[PDB]
Amino acid sequence: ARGPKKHLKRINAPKSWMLNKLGGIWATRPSQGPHKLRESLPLSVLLKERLNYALNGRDVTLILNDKEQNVFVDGKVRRDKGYPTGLMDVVRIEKTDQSFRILYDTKGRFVLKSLSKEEAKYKLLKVTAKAIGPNQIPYIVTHDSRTIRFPNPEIKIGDTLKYDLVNNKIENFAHLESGNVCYIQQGNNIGRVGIIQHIEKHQGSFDICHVKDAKGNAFATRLGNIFVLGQGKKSWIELPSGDGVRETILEERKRKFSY
Amino acid sequence: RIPTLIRNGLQTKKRSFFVVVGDHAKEAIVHLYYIMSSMDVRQNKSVLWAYDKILGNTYGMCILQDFEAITPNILARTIETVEGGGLVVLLLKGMTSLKQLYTMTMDVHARYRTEAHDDVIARFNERFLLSLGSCESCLVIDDELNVLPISGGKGVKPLPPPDEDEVDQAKALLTFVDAIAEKTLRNTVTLTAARGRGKSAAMGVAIAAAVAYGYSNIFITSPSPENLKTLFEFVTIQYIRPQDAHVLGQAELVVIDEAAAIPLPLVKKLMGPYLVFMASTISGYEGTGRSLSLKLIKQLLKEITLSEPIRYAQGDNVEKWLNTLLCLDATLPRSKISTTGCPDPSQCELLHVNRDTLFSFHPVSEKFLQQMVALYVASHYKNSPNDLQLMSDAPAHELFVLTGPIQEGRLPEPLCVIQVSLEGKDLIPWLVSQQFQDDEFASLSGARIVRIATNPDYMSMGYGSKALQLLVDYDYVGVSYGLTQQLHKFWKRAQFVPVYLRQTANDLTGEHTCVMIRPLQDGNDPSWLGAFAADFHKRFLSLLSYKFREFPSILALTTPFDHKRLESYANGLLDYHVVLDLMPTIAQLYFTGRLREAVKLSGLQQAILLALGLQRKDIDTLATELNLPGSQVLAIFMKIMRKVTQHFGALVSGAIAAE
RNA sequence: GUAGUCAUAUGCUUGUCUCAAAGAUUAAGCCAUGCAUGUCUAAGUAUAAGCAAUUUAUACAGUGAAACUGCGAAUGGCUCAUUAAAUCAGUUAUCGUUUAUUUGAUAGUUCCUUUACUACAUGGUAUAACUGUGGUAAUUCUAGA
RNA sequence: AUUCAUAAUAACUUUUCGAAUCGCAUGGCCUUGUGCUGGCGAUGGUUCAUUCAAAUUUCUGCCCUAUCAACUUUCGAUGGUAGGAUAGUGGCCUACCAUGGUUUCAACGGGUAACGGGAAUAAGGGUUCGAUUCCGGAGAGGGAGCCUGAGAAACGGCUACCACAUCCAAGGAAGGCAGCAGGCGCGCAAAUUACCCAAUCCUAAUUCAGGGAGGUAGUGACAAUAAAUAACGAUACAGGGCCCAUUCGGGUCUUGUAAUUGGAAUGAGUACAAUGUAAAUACCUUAACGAGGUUGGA
């Protein structure tokens, strides 16, 4: 192909953005950042269609360009129409001191969870890779594309850390092993939260995992899609749509219109 | 406005002079832009801008930029090129200021005057104003004229309608031309006319009209080329120039275009072997004087003349304008228009008059100078307005006239005229220093006798010398002429001393041009004369051999300097022949030089220097051997000269190169 | 047979209402006429009132002219014309290959001259732009100051 | 999984590296000039992975055909190897040789103008989608070579060549819009060279650049739809009716006013802002203000 793509089509932009089909023809294309294209929510989407603080396109252009700084992502200022806010992030709306979790539904739509000045401090990080680099030093990396220097050594590659944004400090981690709580970042099963049952590795190039939860449903997904929302039953963050558990179309009806 | 008028003009086949006078930018430039868009004989016009190559073509509309300078020849030539409905837009300086205009502003075209700075030329402006002012024919648009009245044009305005314009040649082609009779059929015909008459076209007709097989085959010759294009285009025409022409005799009817230009010797011989049509232009710029034309004809002639222009209708006011401005009119040789005229009888009286005569119009007025001009101009082989302008405005112009009986305001015509042109401080004052030894020669002053002429009826009276004596009577005097044993003695008898004999036969006369000086002041002029004369003495052998014609230099009569000359060729631009001949300084140098004088050194282009100078090898020949591109040959010759000088004396050459 | 043709067939022609289609289809007939990827300051370059437009930073205000920049101008968009080919689909990580983009991170060992290291009160240039001098049927022309 | 790293390690590399940034923030520190104080970013570099990628790449699948039997090896048909290219994998080649091996499961091979093909519901049914190809290779006179660069087999960069193919003061000096429209043509076949970048998308340098995106129209049975547009009623006056199959019988009985009543029927203009082309935003939707004239048979 000519070179590298550079736009994005209304029609082609993820169902996670709950986008306007009739809308236009395009859609703000996520900027190369911390999260992958599909797994992200560009700010313009976050304020216009989400919060609804903005509206028309120029509305954003003001907000992120205005010399006041109205948007914060993980304790930092952002002024990019399409910064890819990803899973388990913390976004603050300066002018109102609003704090949000970037989390998927139970139906897989990006949801905004309101946090208390309390959780707004800690953010959950999942461990990408772990190896030693320059001059005998250990480095850990998080999905959030965080690069960590001198990390606690009791941390295996597929771990989950709790991060104190305020001090850029770590605390209480927890690997994925039979008996923990987890969130699935993507898949025919995303947005779910349950107890890890067991992890059968097949090495041939793809390991799998099982899970249980509230109504004790059986879940199946690939490791790469498991995010440890916590150690031993206690979750670490407040979940959207009540608990991370979806209902039969049948259970939804009976709960709402009670059929 | 003028666009309507333009329509009338092309319909009439006439042209008009549109004078734009005013500020350079204001009237001149902007108006020209507007006129181009507006005036459309066709859509717009070619509007060639002039500020020789152009003649075969014709153009609708043109502009002549006299704002700084006026070259009259160019103006006349430009007009001849313009088609029917065309307008010649003359760009002039502000009208009130024009006459004086020229000074600091100056007539830049002053190449006639050739003072360091250009000057006024008021007289010419005055003559111009007279012709322009005389009648309604020329349109004068002056600045600060919010509205200019345009006589003529759409609506009723001044310009009496001429008939739509659209036999003389036909009467002439075969017709006057059928040369068969008790008298010989083979003879020489000479058709003469002003420019644009159709002489060439007439001459072209005969070419085919005689058919190869059929009427017969023809031939054609001409001087330095001249537009061969019309004749042949109108035409078996083949062309071999006269000299090359001298080869073999094939044809029944020879045609020579503007033969007057060709040497009498060469021309005469050629006319003998066949039957010919002789064409010659007169009564215009770069034409031939009618006085000379008669002498030329006498050498034979069936002469015929064509009166009407092919390109425009007769009576074209533009053409009338230029003729009058330029003083095209010839009448004095046959006769003057008055009680007197024609031969000038009575005792000849010698007198001088100044340029000032030009302004006054009374006794001694524009007329006296005009008459003098007509006479000298008439007697010359070629006529040119540069002469006229020079006569009018140029400083340092002095005249002497030989006149017949003078009494009342109107008397008989002049017998003779002498035009002296100060020179110093072209021709006698440009070359004495390039060609001679003293770098300084250009500095002094002298008066060249540009033109001397005695009415043919009056000749051999001694009036000619009488004219010269009057010139001296009340640094030196000089003259340049085609060398003739006869003419030289005239000048020698005049008291001139032979200065130089150049290399190239006059293209027109066929004789080599010599220069002579009549020493007025001893301080340096007799010195320059004698010194040059001596130099010529040393050079004499060199010249004779070089001439090819190898004519010995009688002239009017029955070294360290060489080093300077040599350096000038080596270090500078002086030309080869100047240094070279068989043996001027250059051959002198080769004899002495141990170097390649032979195959490489000596003096000239070929073996670089020797092969051309000694061998007389062709430029083309040595360029090949030497493997030079051409032009480079001269450079090599110069380099060779430098080398020889250095070998002779390094220190001397260095100083000479330096200063 | 039946007429009809709920056959057309086109062949005749009339309030208020719109989710609203129209030289890929022929030849992958192209440029009439119309037309055309450049650009900004917290930010890199502007005149001690000849960019200069004010106005009085004031040793460098804006303010911009122009340039320098520095960027994209490998994007598409129309085009099978091909193509029986992995084209393409899945279906490969690439111990086999390259990588702007984006972050993240981030870098004490440069002498050690035999520290006038000079001494960094951070170098040198170079140039435009710029004033001008031009040229030429005439350039995205171009000359030379 | 490593000869992996990231180690070193020496050497030895015309080889790097390494903010002569600018921006506000200069008030705290001591000093008192000082030394700082740099704050903070802008402006860099560094390598790594950071998406960016591509780029390979196994592993299923184009029409028919055995009347395809056989195929493929001079340098590749194979292996394997030396190198060299390749940016970097590769017979890709330099070699150098291996003879390879493909194949009736038809292989060699042939023949199908072939450019080329995503959603979801759903007892059953209901239905439907993405939107004229999601997907996805090869053209931008011919040829050539070259171009940018993170990044082109660079169409729309060149050149130069060819060709066309053009302006001309003679001289030189053009020019390839299947990214549009347009006229020819073609000639099967279809609307002004609308309005805006109002969105929503685009690019993009620190803003609000620019967006031939997009949008908006119109045109436009286009396919069209819709299917709703003079009747409601006052009176008189009354001939007798008027129909039948009718042949005569029968049926019985309003019917004409080219008579006199009905509401301030209604249509059409006028602010009317406007979902509204922030301008289409008066054209919508209002609102009102006003305001009825085929046939046959003499």
mmCIF file of C-alpha atoms (C1' of nucleotides) in Angstrom, chain D residues 28-238:
data_model
loop_
_atom_site.group_PDB
_atom_site.id
_atom_site.type_symbol
_atom_site.label_atom_id
_atom_site.label_comp_id
_atom_site.label_asym_id
_atom_site.label_seq_id
_atom_site.Cartn_x
_atom_site.Cartn_y
_atom_site.Cartn_z
ATOM 1 C "C1'" G D 28 14.087 31.794 46.766
ATOM 2 C "C1'" C D 29 19.065 30.305 48.374
ATOM 3 C "C1'" C D 30 23.976 33.735 50.088
ATOM 4 C "C1'" U D 31 26.613 37.138 48.535
ATOM 5 C "C1'" U D 32 26.859 41.836 49.407
ATOM 6 C "C1'" G D 33 27.710 42.286 43.224
ATOM 7 C "C1'" U D 34 27.818 36.663 43.818
ATOM 8 C "C1'" G D 35 26.943 31.338 43.311
ATOM 9 C "C1'" C D 36 23.219 30.382 41.946
ATOM 10 C "C1'" U D 37 17.823 29.832 41.622
ATOM 11 C "C1'" G D 38 16.030 27.047 37.654
ATOM 12 C "C1'" G D 39 11.065 26.327 37.707
ATOM 13 C "C1'" C D 40 8.632 24.751 33.988
ATOM 14 C "C1'" G D 41 7.641 23.244 29.772
ATOM 15 C "C1'" A D 42 9.636 24.698 23.906
ATOM 16 C "C1'" U D 43 13.852 22.955 21.239
ATOM 17 C "C1'" G D 44 16.425 18.461 20.966
ATOM 18 C "C1'" G D 45 19.531 13.371 21.331
ATOM 19 C "C1'" U D 46 19.769 8.188 22.994
ATOM 20 C "C1'" U D 47 18.837 3.290 22.449
ATOM 21 C "C1'" C D 48 14.566 -0.282 23.608
ATOM 22 C "C1'" A D 49 9.448 -1.626 22.721
ATOM 23 C "C1'" U D 50 5.812 2.128 21.892
ATOM 24 C "C1'" U D 51 1.960 1.107 19.302
ATOM 25 C "C1'" C D 52 3.375 2.570 13.042
ATOM 26 C "C1'" A D 53 4.213 -0.708 10.234
ATOM 27 C "C1'" A D 54 5.143 -3.506 6.580
ATOM 28 C "C1'" A D 55 7.404 -7.475 5.341
ATOM 29 C "C1'" U D 56 7.526 -11.966 4.849
ATOM 30 C "C1'" U D 57 4.964 -16.687 6.741
ATOM 31 C "C1'" U D 58 2.828 -21.818 7.621
ATOM 32 C "C1'" C D 59 -1.485 -23.993 7.972
ATOM 33 C "C1'" U D 60 -7.860 -24.282 4.160
ATOM 34 C "C1'" G D 61 -9.779 -22.445 -0.592
ATOM 35 C "C1'" C D 62 -10.184 -20.036 -8.888
ATOM 36 C "C1'" C D 63 -13.752 -23.005 -13.848
ATOM 37 C "C1'" C D 64 -13.220 -27.100 -16.525
ATOM 38 C "C1'" U D 65 -9.494 -30.965 -18.518
ATOM 39 C "C1'" A D 66 -6.160 -37.302 -18.370
ATOM 40 C "C1'" U D 67 -8.527 -36.355 -24.754
ATOM 41 C "C1'" C D 68 -3.645 -32.986 -19.042
ATOM 42 C "C1'" A D 69 1.008 -38.585 -17.605
ATOM 43 C "C1'" A D 70 4.202 -37.165 -16.633
ATOM 44 C "C1'" C D 71 6.821 -32.609 -14.920
ATOM 45 C "C1'" U D 72 10.530 -29.692 -13.715
ATOM 46 C "C1'" U D 73 17.672 -29.815 -13.666
ATOM 47 C "C1'" U D 74 22.943 -25.628 -17.711
ATOM 48 C "C1'" C D 75 23.509 -22.861 -13.280
ATOM 49 C "C1'" G D 76 18.207 -24.080 -10.573
ATOM 50 C "C1'" A D 77 14.610 -28.635 -10.994
ATOM 51 C "C1'" U D 78 16.101 -29.966 -6.410
ATOM 52 C "C1'" G D 79 19.816 -30.332 -2.092
ATOM 53 C "C1'" G D 80 23.688 -28.338 -0.331
ATOM 54 C "C1'" U D 81 27.520 -25.038 -0.116
ATOM 55 C "C1'" A D 82 31.082 -20.111 -0.735
ATOM 56 C "C1'" G D 83 30.253 -15.382 -1.408
ATOM 57 C "C1'" G D 84 27.704 -11.524 -2.958
ATOM 58 C "C1'" A D 85 24.124 -8.741 -3.217
ATOM 59 C "C1'" U D 86 20.337 -7.256 -0.898
ATOM 60 C "C1'" A D 87 18.379 -2.898 4.686
ATOM 61 C "C1'" G D 88 18.049 -6.922 6.106
ATOM 62 C "C1'" U D 89 15.119 -14.061 4.755
ATOM 63 C "C1'" G D 90 15.319 -16.354 0.662
ATOM 64 C "C1'" G D 91 18.709 -20.331 -6.332
ATOM 65 C "C1'" C D 92 17.935 -14.388 -5.498
ATOM 66 C "C1'" C D 93 22.190 -14.624 -7.653
ATOM 67 C "C1'" U D 94 28.281 -15.877 -7.585
ATOM 68 C "C1'" A D 95 29.965 -19.962 -7.842
ATOM 69 C "C1'" C D 96 30.057 -25.081 -6.388
ATOM 70 C "C1'" C D 97 28.426 -29.432 -6.868
ATOM 71 C "C1'" A D 98 24.094 -32.684 -4.868
ATOM 72 C "C1'" U D 99 20.570 -35.113 -8.757
ATOM 73 C "C1'" G D 100 16.677 -33.416 -7.199
ATOM 74 C "C1'" G D 101 12.178 -33.744 -6.322
ATOM 75 C "C1'" U D 102 6.536 -32.358 -8.469
ATOM 76 C "C1'" U D 103 2.940 -35.718 -9.969
ATOM 77 C "C1'" U D 104 -3.946 -40.219 -11.549
ATOM 78 C "C1'" C D 105 -5.534 -36.903 -4.749
ATOM 79 C "C1'" A D 106 -4.113 -35.996 -12.693
ATOM 80 C "C1'" A D 107 0.664 -33.610 -11.069
ATOM 81 C "C1'" C D 108 3.783 -31.407 -16.303
ATOM 82 C "C1'" G D 109 -0.094 -29.698 -17.618
ATOM 83 C "C1'" G D 110 -3.920 -27.721 -20.351
ATOM 84 C "C1'" G D 111 -8.946 -24.950 -21.141
ATOM 85 C "C1'" U D 112 -13.285 -20.827 -17.199
ATOM 86 C "C1'" A D 113 -11.244 -11.735 -19.760
ATOM 87 C "C1'" A D 114 -10.304 -13.869 -14.046
ATOM 88 C "C1'" C D 115 -8.658 -8.245 -12.158
ATOM 89 C "C1'" G D 116 -10.707 -10.561 -8.659
ATOM 90 C "C1'" G D 117 -14.863 -11.303 -3.416
ATOM 91 C "C1'" G D 118 -18.198 -8.656 5.698
ATOM 92 C "C1'" A D 119 -24.207 -8.626 10.355
ATOM 93 C "C1'" A D 120 -27.460 -10.511 13.140
ATOM 94 C "C1'" U D 121 -31.632 -12.389 14.551
ATOM 95 C "C1'" A D 122 -33.482 -16.180 14.509
ATOM 96 C "C1'" A D 123 -40.019 -22.405 18.873
ATOM 97 C "C1'" G D 124 -41.260 -22.423 13.688
ATOM 98 C "C1'" G D 125 -41.832 -18.315 11.260
ATOM 99 C "C1'" G D 126 -40.427 -12.519 12.028
ATOM 100 C "C1'" U D 127 -36.520 -10.696 9.245
ATOM 101 C "C1'" U D 128 -32.505 -8.563 7.603
ATOM 102 C "C1'" C D 129 -27.983 -6.035 7.590
ATOM 103 C "C1'" G D 130 -22.628 -3.810 6.314
ATOM 104 C "C1'" A D 131 -24.630 -0.241 2.161
ATOM 105 C "C1'" U D 132 -22.799 -0.706 -7.025
ATOM 106 C "C1'" U D 133 -16.718 -6.067 -4.342
ATOM 107 C "C1'" C D 134 -15.878 -5.251 3.655
ATOM 108 C "C1'" C D 135 -11.941 -8.013 1.114
ATOM 109 C "C1'" G D 136 -8.071 -7.562 -2.120
ATOM 110 C "C1'" G D 137 -3.155 -7.598 -6.343
ATOM 111 C "C1'" A D 138 -1.832 -4.567 -11.280
ATOM 112 C "C1'" G D 139 -2.251 2.295 -15.102
ATOM 113 C "C1'" A D 140 -1.321 6.485 -14.985
ATOM 114 C "C1'" G D 141 2.358 8.253 -23.958
ATOM 115 C "C1'" G D 142 6.394 4.562 -25.123
ATOM 116 C "C1'" G D 143 10.831 3.201 -22.970
ATOM 117 C "C1'" A D 144 15.068 4.249 -19.684
ATOM 118 C "C1'" G D 145 17.182 5.600 -15.689
ATOM 119 C "C1'" C D 146 17.022 7.675 -11.916
ATOM 120 C "C1'" C D 147 13.576 11.379 -7.043
ATOM 121 C "C1'" U D 148 11.409 11.765 -1.505
ATOM 122 C "C1'" G D 149 12.638 9.559 2.112
ATOM 123 C "C1'" A D 150 11.050 6.595 8.776
ATOM 124 C "C1'" G D 151 8.833 5.713 4.785
ATOM 125 C "C1'" A D 152 7.264 5.068 -3.016
ATOM 126 C "C1'" A D 153 8.782 0.079 -7.808
ATOM 127 C "C1'" A D 154 7.036 7.570 -6.225
ATOM 128 C "C1'" C D 155 2.061 7.839 -11.502
ATOM 129 C "C1'" G D 156 0.647 11.942 -10.662
ATOM 130 C "C1'" G D 157 9.520 13.749 -8.641
ATOM 131 C "C1'" C D 158 12.574 14.074 -12.020
ATOM 132 C "C1'" U D 159 15.584 13.391 -16.078
ATOM 133 C "C1'" A D 160 16.840 11.889 -20.517
ATOM 134 C "C1'" C D 161 15.248 9.237 -24.683
ATOM 135 C "C1'" C D 162 11.520 8.249 -27.949
ATOM 136 C "C1'" A D 163 7.063 9.623 -29.529
ATOM 137 C "C1'" C D 164 3.479 12.951 -29.759
ATOM 138 C "C1'" A D 165 3.006 17.806 -29.195
ATOM 139 C "C1'" U D 166 2.631 23.522 -28.658
ATOM 140 C "C1'" C D 167 4.156 29.003 -28.542
ATOM 141 C "C1'" C D 168 6.434 32.307 -30.780
ATOM 142 C "C1'" A D 169 10.730 39.150 -32.814
ATOM 143 C "C1'" A D 170 13.361 33.382 -34.206
ATOM 144 C "C1'" G D 171 15.528 32.876 -31.347
ATOM 145 C "C1'" G D 172 14.110 29.944 -28.402
ATOM 146 C "C1'" A D 173 10.544 29.067 -25.497
ATOM 147 C "C1'" A D 174 5.090 23.999 -24.208
ATOM 148 C "C1'" G D 175 2.588 20.542 -23.048
ATOM 149 C "C1'" G D 176 0.291 13.552 -20.942
ATOM 150 C "C1'" C D 177 -6.303 16.449 -15.272
ATOM 151 C "C1'" A D 178 -9.233 6.143 -15.843
ATOM 152 C "C1'" G D 179 -8.152 12.838 -8.594
ATOM 153 C "C1'" C D 180 -13.025 16.407 -12.098
ATOM 154 C "C1'" A D 181 -16.650 18.296 -15.459
ATOM 155 C "C1'" G D 182 -16.970 19.898 -20.147
ATOM 156 C "C1'" G D 183 -17.414 19.670 -26.211
ATOM 157 C "C1'" C D 184 -16.065 16.493 -29.870
ATOM 158 C "C1'" G D 185 -16.253 11.937 -30.320
ATOM 159 C "C1'" C D 186 -18.280 7.433 -28.051
ATOM 160 C "C1'" G D 187 -21.613 7.822 -29.892
ATOM 161 C "C1'" C D 188 -26.396 2.607 -25.287
ATOM 162 C "C1'" A D 189 -27.816 4.674 -21.288
ATOM 163 C "C1'" A D 190 -28.690 8.943 -17.573
ATOM 164 C "C1'" A D 191 -28.774 16.726 -13.127
ATOM 165 C "C1'" U D 192 -25.860 23.536 -12.721
ATOM 166 C "C1'" U D 193 -18.584 23.531 -14.529
ATOM 167 C "C1'" A D 194 -25.447 24.706 -7.317
ATOM 168 C "C1'" C D 195 -24.178 25.764 -1.072
ATOM 169 C "C1'" C D 196 -21.309 25.032 2.739
ATOM 170 C "C1'" C D 197 -16.587 22.386 4.901
ATOM 171 C "C1'" A D 198 -23.353 24.214 9.306
ATOM 172 C "C1'" A D 199 -21.664 18.853 10.996
ATOM 173 C "C1'" U D 200 -18.557 14.969 11.096
ATOM 174 C "C1'" C D 201 -14.355 13.290 9.433
ATOM 175 C "C1'" C D 202 -9.821 14.655 7.200
ATOM 176 C "C1'" U D 203 -4.786 16.619 7.226
ATOM 177 C "C1'" A D 204 -1.674 19.123 9.693
ATOM 178 C "C1'" A D 205 2.703 22.616 12.352
ATOM 179 C "C1'" U D 206 1.327 25.080 20.268
ATOM 180 C "C1'" U D 207 -4.392 28.258 16.029
ATOM 181 C "C1'" C D 208 -8.490 27.184 15.280
ATOM 182 C "C1'" A D 209 -4.292 26.252 8.641
ATOM 183 C "C1'" G D 210 -6.431 23.972 5.509
ATOM 184 C "C1'" G D 211 -9.406 20.230 4.216
ATOM 185 C "C1'" G D 212 -12.365 18.270 -3.354
ATOM 186 C "C1'" A D 213 -13.913 14.520 2.776
ATOM 187 C "C1'" G D 214 -18.375 15.341 4.005
ATOM 188 C "C1'" G D 215 -22.340 18.051 3.793
ATOM 189 C "C1'" U D 216 -26.042 20.611 1.720
ATOM 190 C "C1'" A D 217 -29.351 21.625 -2.167
ATOM 191 C "C1'" G D 218 -31.519 22.193 -6.219
ATOM 192 C "C1'" U D 219 -32.444 19.318 -10.895
ATOM 193 C "C1'" G D 220 -34.460 15.308 -10.936
ATOM 194 C "C1'" A D 221 -41.746 9.263 -11.045
ATOM 195 C "C1'" C D 222 -35.246 9.288 -10.365
ATOM 196 C "C1'" A D 223 -38.115 4.660 -8.256
ATOM 197 C "C1'" A D 224 -41.178 7.310 -6.653
ATOM 198 C "C1'" U D 225 -44.408 7.832 -3.649
ATOM 199 C "C1'" A D 226 -48.405 9.555 -1.401
ATOM 200 C "C1'" A D 227 -53.321 9.575 -2.149
ATOM 201 C "C1'" A D 228 -55.931 13.673 0.642
ATOM 202 C "C1'" U D 229 -58.320 18.912 -3.124
ATOM 203 C "C1'" A D 230 -65.985 22.420 -3.885
ATOM 204 C "C1'" A D 231 -69.373 20.974 -1.097
ATOM 205 C "C1'" C D 232 -72.561 21.139 3.332
ATOM 206 C "C1'" G D 233 -76.705 22.147 4.378
ATOM 207 C "C1'" A D 234 -82.188 27.442 3.777
ATOM 208 C "C1'" U D 235 -86.697 28.043 1.209
ATOM 209 C "C1'" A D 236 -90.248 28.228 -2.709
ATOM 210 C "C1'" C D 237 -91.748 26.304 -7.088
ATOM 211 C "C1'" A D 238 -93.857 22.193 -8.952
#
